[PDB]
Structure formats: structure tokens, C-alpha cells
Amino acid sequence: EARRPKAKAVISEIDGVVRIEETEEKLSVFVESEGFSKEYKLPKEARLLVKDGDYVEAGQPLTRGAIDPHQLLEAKGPEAVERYLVEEIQKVYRAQG
Hints:
Blueprint: E1 16-23, E2 26-32, E3 39-42, E4 55-56, H1 69-76, H2 78-94
Antiparallel strand pairs: 1-2, 1-4, 2-3
Helix pairs in contact: 1-2
């Protein structure tokens, strides 16, 4: 159905590189670019897939979870989401043999 999952991962909108900032009542992450960048608020214990300073494709997931295909489609394009969907569906079937 292409529904946006409840426990949704947060993906990077552009190319850039990361830097963490973990204070008590907020933990925001920035994918800084050779031009300008955006800031990604998220709840603190949310798990990361980005080592600080690492380099990220556009649509590469930063938190872990399901990926809203639409967020993916605008960022990375048709073939990219076409990929995700096929694989993400097979994972389910494989797991029941």
C-alpha cells in the first residue's frame, strides 16, 4: 500500500556529512553540506546508523527503522524506491521460507 510506517526512520535529504550533538533534553543531528544543510531533531534513545563525520547519500537512512517510500522517492528517485520495495517485501517471505 505504500503506507508511511509508524516507527519511521529519518533519511538524509541531500549529500553531505554528519555531526552529532547530544545534550540532556535534546539530541539533534546535522548532515552538513558544502553549501548549506538542515537539522534532524529526534528522540534521544533513537538508534543511529551514522558514525559522526561519516558521508551519506541522499535518502541514506540515519536512524534505523522502516523507510517511508515517498520520502525515499523524492530524495533518491524511482529506481531507488523500486529497489527498496522489492527487497523489503522479499525479506518477509524469505523469513517464512
